[PDB]
């Protein structure tokens, strides 16, 4: 009976089994006997698995014996081995015919682990250094190392997938992905593992730059091989070293510019779901790089760009100024030279409001962000396109005669001057001035004016069901500005004389201000102070973020005038390699001193 | 052992360590018996006692309690229901954590009167901290928000219809035919029927709590300000009966409370509730000195 055979494994006896096997020979879910044997093992105390594989001999089509439930669809008896650290039993199964098993069940992509679906990304994701060794070496059948899954995840793939950023974690998840990429190199010394891609086309590295895995980054961007067969695995090198001092350099593959995403331009557009995209820049390459490129190709573009918006701003201040007042929009063109001027200066204005309402639209179709976090991730992009949108409102509304364009004007030029504090991120000094200003506005103001909101609008009218009228002092729109004067100094604890009992009015007064004027605002000055002894330094990363935003997209915008002029590093021979004794690459060069070493 | 610890490193330490010995003897010896069952006079179970005395390492080691051997398994109250690489998926026992035969654990922690040392880090344990969240998550969050609809509402009624207040002679006044003196007096009525619930909702309250009187502004600052709008809704209705002008003074009061009361509400969301908090403790400690 099954459920005997199964009492009986479970039990860890091999006697039903040997009463059964010379009339076995006379003669759901799907779990096999040998499964059930080794998942009721104790102390390598289960033993049936030879019994059971020798009697089939005796009888290749069990070897390959599979679960059925979409919960564990395709689990594999080599995977259950695996995943106890199984040596013995791992390499019996091997030698016996029983490393290509696709575990493509729910559990293996709602509560789960993911390391793959292959025996080989089970054995490297677990830590298993020795048993990875063997099936990948195995003789009877060696386990494949470029293997690709479902969602196109390799070994590699898989190791960025597992990584969690802490320092033990990231510690064994470097050391194995360095041993298996060597070992793809002694075994295939012609392929090239890296640049192997999943569905979504993102190489382990790009992969491990999106995720927010700065660990594995960081090593991988670090990487340099001394052994002399695989030295072409290598992505940084030393150049010469005299004394103390030392010249490397790095690779840049495809950092600055690669196919379809680099490593920069996924860092800096991340959608701010990562973790750590600010930090991300902190990596010794990137830094060098983004320094390098601000120094020599686009501060001048940037300052010339400033002073392009300056003047802009200039002259559509300039022009608001002079509107013309008599009669209803349009006006007729006077002869006089200032209003030639004048109307130049306005179609200039409009000129740029459209220009700034394309560029908005363009950013909104390329970088398609959330409707949540839309005032976390850029704060100054629907400034711009607010900017852009009153102005075009004005430009709507002044030939449709009608005196209301003014009121749109007047905000989009407010706006204008307001948004000039931009430009303070070419400057560290006043770019991280700008970015606490944001920090506040988004956070403490909107606590507190929804706070102070409730208490105001609770006195109000509590003051104005007490007041009668019998100027116009009992009104809600008056009152509540009445009270609002109190937070700026300019209360008059007595501005009306209309009230039935005088008591209740100045209780109700000095309520107010012990409760919003001394309570609260001092509250709020406190709470602006913590807040900026806390964000003191990631002000100083959000800054440095937006420089680099700053500079990818300048140099994209400008391909046109010099596409390739400006490539970063220089082009040069490292050493040789195996394949073909030829490495070139764009390396970048950085200088370095230390004692210690000597 | 419940009744001499200290909430220190080491005497927790060796309480914990004798609690688990003599527990396991106790299994041993009467493998029929079941000992934590036992209470006092007070009628409080050890794991009652410790919570609400206010020794929380006695009660995370009680609720955290596990033990593999086979006679003795039923002692434990943690179980581990699988694991597979470096995953796990454990039980916890609840036995009557949720709902218990007069007093369970979460309802001594929550309803303390203060005099504990830390009735607050007492809900930092494991299986309280997630029956929380969940209980937010699933079957409450809907039911607060809208008891803060309704609030909002019955403010809103409340204030438009003391905004209209009659003005012309003395209370009472005759009801005009117009519909919006209808209006008027139904939203009237409207208030006074809230303030008749919140008054009844503070006594009942007071009742059931008997809480001090030196520490009646730490314990609770919200259910007396809550009683007091009441009062003065009430008071306002017996002066406008009365034949009294008076009642506008206390009506007045009593609406600037009910909006500043709104803050109340704010204890739903994480970063308004920590907000009106810091009020509360400002307001009781910095303005009085
Ligand atoms: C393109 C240029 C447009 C920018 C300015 C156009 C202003 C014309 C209005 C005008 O002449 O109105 C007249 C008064 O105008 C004046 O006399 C004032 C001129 C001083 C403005 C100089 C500051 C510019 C910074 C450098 C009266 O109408
Ligand atoms: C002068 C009239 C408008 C120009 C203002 C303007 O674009 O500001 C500057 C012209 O900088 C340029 O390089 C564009 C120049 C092209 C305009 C030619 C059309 C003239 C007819 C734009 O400066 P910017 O800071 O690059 O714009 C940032 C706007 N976002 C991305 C923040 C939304
Ligand atoms: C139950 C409902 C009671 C709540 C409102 C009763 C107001 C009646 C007073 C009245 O009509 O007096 C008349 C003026 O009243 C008006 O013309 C003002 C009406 C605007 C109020 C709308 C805001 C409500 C939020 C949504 C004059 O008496
Ligand atoms: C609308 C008129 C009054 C209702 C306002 C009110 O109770 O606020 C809400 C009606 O929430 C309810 O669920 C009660 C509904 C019953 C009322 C029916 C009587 C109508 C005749 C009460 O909301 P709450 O926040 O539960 O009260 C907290 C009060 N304490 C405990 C802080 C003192
Ligand atoms: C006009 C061109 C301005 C040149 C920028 C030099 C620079 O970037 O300075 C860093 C920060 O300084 C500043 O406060 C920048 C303020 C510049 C004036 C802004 C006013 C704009 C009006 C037009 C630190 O420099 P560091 O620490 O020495 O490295
Ligand atoms: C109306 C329903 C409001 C939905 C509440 C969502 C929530 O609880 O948000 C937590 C705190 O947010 C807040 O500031 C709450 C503010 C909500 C608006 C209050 C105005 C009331 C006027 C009526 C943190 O969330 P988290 O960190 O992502 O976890
Ligand atoms: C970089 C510069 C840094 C600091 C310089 C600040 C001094 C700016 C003074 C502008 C002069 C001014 O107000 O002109 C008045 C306003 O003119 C403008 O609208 C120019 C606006 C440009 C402002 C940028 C500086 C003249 O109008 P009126 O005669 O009053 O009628
Ligand atoms: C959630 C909403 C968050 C923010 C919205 C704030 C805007 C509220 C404006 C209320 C309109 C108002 O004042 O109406 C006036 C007052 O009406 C009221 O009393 C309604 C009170 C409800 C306030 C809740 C918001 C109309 O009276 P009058 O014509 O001045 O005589
Ligand atoms: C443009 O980029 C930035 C801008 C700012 C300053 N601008 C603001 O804070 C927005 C204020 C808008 C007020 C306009 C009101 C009108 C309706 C009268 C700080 C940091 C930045 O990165
Ligand atoms: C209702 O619960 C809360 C309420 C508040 C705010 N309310 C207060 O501070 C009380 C102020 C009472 C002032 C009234 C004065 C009348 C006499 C004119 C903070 C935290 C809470 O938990």
């Given at each position: 009976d099954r459920?005997?055979?199964?009492?009986?494994?479970?039990?860890?006896?091999?006697?039903?089994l040997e009463s059964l096997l010379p009339f076995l020979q006379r003669s759901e879910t799907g779990k096999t006997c040998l499964l059930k044997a080794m998942l009721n093992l104790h102390n390598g105390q289960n033993d049936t698995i030879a019994l059971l594989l020798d009697v089939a001999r005796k009888t290749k089509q069990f070897v390959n014996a599979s679960y059925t439930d979409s919960y564990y669809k395709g689990q594999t008896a080599?995977?259950?081995?695996?995943?106890?650290?199984?040596?013995?039993?791992?390499?019996?199964?091997?030698?016996?015919?029983?490393?290509?098993?696709?575990?493509?069940?729910?559990?293996?992509?709602?509560?789960?682990?993911?390391?793959?679906?292959?025996?080989?990304?089970?054995?490297?994701?677990?830590?298993?250094?020795?048993?990875?060794?063997?099936?990948?070496?195995?003789?009877?059948?060696?386990?494949?190392?470029?293997?690709?899954?479902?969602?196109?995840?390799?070994?590699?793939?898989?190791?960025?997938?597992?990584?969690?950023?802490?320092?033990?974690?990231?510690?064994?998840?470097?050391?194995?992905?360095?041993?298996?990429?060597?070992?793809?190199?002694?075994?295939?010394?012609?392929?090239?593992?890296?640049?192997?891609?999943?569905?979504?086309?993102?190489?382990?590295?790009?992969?491990?730059?999106?995720?927010?895995?700065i660990g594995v980054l960081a090593y991988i961007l670090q990487r340099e091989?001394?052994?002399?067969?695989?030295?072409?695995?290598?992505?940084?090198?030393?150049?010469?070293?005299?004394?103390?001092?030392?010249?490397?350099?790095?690779?840049?593959?495809?950092?600055?510019?690669?196919?379809?995403?680099?490593?920069?331009?996924?860092?800096?557009?991340?959608?701010?779901?990562?973790?750590?995209?600010?930090?991300?820049?902190?990596?010794?390459?990137?830094?060098?790089?983004?320094?390098?490129?601000?120094?020599?190709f686009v501060k001048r573009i940037?300052?010339?760009?400033?002073?392009?918006?300056?003047?802009?701003?200039?002259?559509?201040?300039?022009?608001?100024?002079?509107?013309?007042?008599?009669?209803?929009?349009?006006?007729?063109?006077?002869?006089?030279?200032?209003?030639?001027?004048?109307?130049?200066?306005?179609?200039?204005?409009?000129?740029?409001?459209?220009?700034?309402?394309?560029?908005?639209?363009?950013?909104?179709?390329?970088?398609?962000?959330?409707?949540?976090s839309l005032f976390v991730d850029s704060y100054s992009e629907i400034l711009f396109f607010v900017q852009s949108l009153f102005m075009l409102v004005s430009v709507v509304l002044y030939f449709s005669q009608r005196k209301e364009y003014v009121a749109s004007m007047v905000f989009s030029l407010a706006m204008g001057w307001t948004n000039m504090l931009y430009y303070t991120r070419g400057f560290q000094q006043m770019g991280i001035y700008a970015v606490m200003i944001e920090k506040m506005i988004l956070r403490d103001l909107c606590r507190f004016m929804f706070v102070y909101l409730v208490f105001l609008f609770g006195f109000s009218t509590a003051v104005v069901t007490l007041i009668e009228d019998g100027n116009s002092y009992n009104s809600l729109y008056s009152t509540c500005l009445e009270l609002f004067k109190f937070t700026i100094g300019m209360g008059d604890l007595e501005f009306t004389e209309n009230y039935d009992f005088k008591a209740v009015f100045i209780i109700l007064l000095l309520a107010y201000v012990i409760l919003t004027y001394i309570l609260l605002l001092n509250m709020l000055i406190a709470l602006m102070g913590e807040t900026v002894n806390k964000i003191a330094?990631?002000?100083?990363?959000?800054?440095?973020?937006?420089?680099?935003?700053?500079?990818?997209?300048?140099?994209?915008?400008?391909?046109?005038?010099?596409?390739?002029?400006?490539?970063?590093?220089?082009?040069?021979?490292?050493?040789?390699?195996?394949?073909?004794?030829?490495?070139?690459?764009?390396?970048?060069?950085?200088?370095?001193?230390?004692?210690?070493?000597?």
């Open positions: 459920r005997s055979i199964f009492d009986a494994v479970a039990q860890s006896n091999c006697q039903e080599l995977h259950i081995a695996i995943e106890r650290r199984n040596m013995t039993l791992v390499t019996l199964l091997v030698e016996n015919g029983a490393v290509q098993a696709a575990a493509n069940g729910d559990f293996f992509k709602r509560p789960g682990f993911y390391f793959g679906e292959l025996p080989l990304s089970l054995a490297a994701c677990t830590n298993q250094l020795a048993i990875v060794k063997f099936l990948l070496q195995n003789s009877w059948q060696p386990a494949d190392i470029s293997a690709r899954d479902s969602v196109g995840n390799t070994v590699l793939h898989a190791l960025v997938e597992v990584a969690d950023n802490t320092v033990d974690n990231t510690k064994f998840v470097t050391s194995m992905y360095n041993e298996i990429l060597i070992l793809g190199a002694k075994l295939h010394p012609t392929l090239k593992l890296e640049e192997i891609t999943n569905r979504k086309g993102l190489t382990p590295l790009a992969l491990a730059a999106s995720s927010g895995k091989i001394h052994e002399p067969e695989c030295r072409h695995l290598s992505r940084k090198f030393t150049e010469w070293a005299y004394g103390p001092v030392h010249s490397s350099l790095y690779d840049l593959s495809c950092i600055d510019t690669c196919e379809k995403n680099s490593v920069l331009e996924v860092i800096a557009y991340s959608s701010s779901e990562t973790p750590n995209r600010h930090d991300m820049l902190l990596v010794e390459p990137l830094n060098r790089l983004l320094q390098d490129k601000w120094d020599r940037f300052y010339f760009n400033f002073f392009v918006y300056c003047l802009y701003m200039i002259i559509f201040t300039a022009a608001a100024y002079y509107r013309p007042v008599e009669g209803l929009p349009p006006y007729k063109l006077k002869n006089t030279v200032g209003d030639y001027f004048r109307v130049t200066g306005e179609i200039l204005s409009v000129s740029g409001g459209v220009y700034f309402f394309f560029r908005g639209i363009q950013y909104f179709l390329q970088r398609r962000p959330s409707l949540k330094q990631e002000s100083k990363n959000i800054w440095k973020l937006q420089r680099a935003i700053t500079i990818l997209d300048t140099e994209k915008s400008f391909l046109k005038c010099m596409r390739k002029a400006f490539r970063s590093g220089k082009l040069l021979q490292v050493g040789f390699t195996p394949d073909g004794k030829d490495d070139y690459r764009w390396c970048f060069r950085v200088d370095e001193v230390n004692w210690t070493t000597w």
